[PDB]
């Protein structure tokens, strides 16, 4: 879902667009997330906070299936007790600012399942290599 258009398509440009349309511009927010006598200390701790946050997010990705995919799929199924709404009414109706609030309570339940499924898939892969 990308077409020909000459406008800049910049950082947080599609924050209000629906989340089926902001997904076609995710490398922009990924790009503009890292590079940007006493005050050098303040600037320096701001820069190390930036690189620490980037490393924490890349570590959360890396212990899951995707390390540099930027769109990755996994093997845990969507529990319908979490959001109980249709597939057609998320990708064409709501935004990420509005979808963030609706699963913020069910966040950190999902991440443990992601790590659990990735650890189980790693040990299944190790056993499948080991039986050969």
């Amino acid at each position: 879902a990308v077409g020909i258009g000459a406008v800049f398509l910049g950082f947080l440009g599609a924050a209000g667009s629906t989340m089926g349309a902001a997904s076609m511009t995710l490398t922009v927010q990924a790009r503009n997330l890292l590079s940007g006598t006493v005050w050098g200390i303040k600037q320096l701790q701001a820069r190390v906070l930036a690189v620490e946050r980037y490393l924490r997010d890349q570590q959360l990705l890396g212990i899951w299936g995707c390390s540099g995919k930027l769109i990755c799929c996994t093997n845990v199924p969507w529990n319908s007790s979490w959001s109980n709404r249709n597939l057609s009414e998320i990708w064409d109706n709501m935004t990420w600012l509005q979808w963030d609030k609706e699963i913020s309570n069910y966040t950190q339940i999902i991440y443990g399942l992601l790590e659990e499924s990735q650890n189980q898939q790693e040990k299944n892969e190790q056993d499948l290599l080991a039986l050969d």
Partner: peptide, 8 residues
């Protein structure tokens, strides 16, 4: 840059 359809 301007952000469309957003309200804070």
């Amino acid at each position: 840059i301007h952000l469309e359809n957003v309200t804070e």
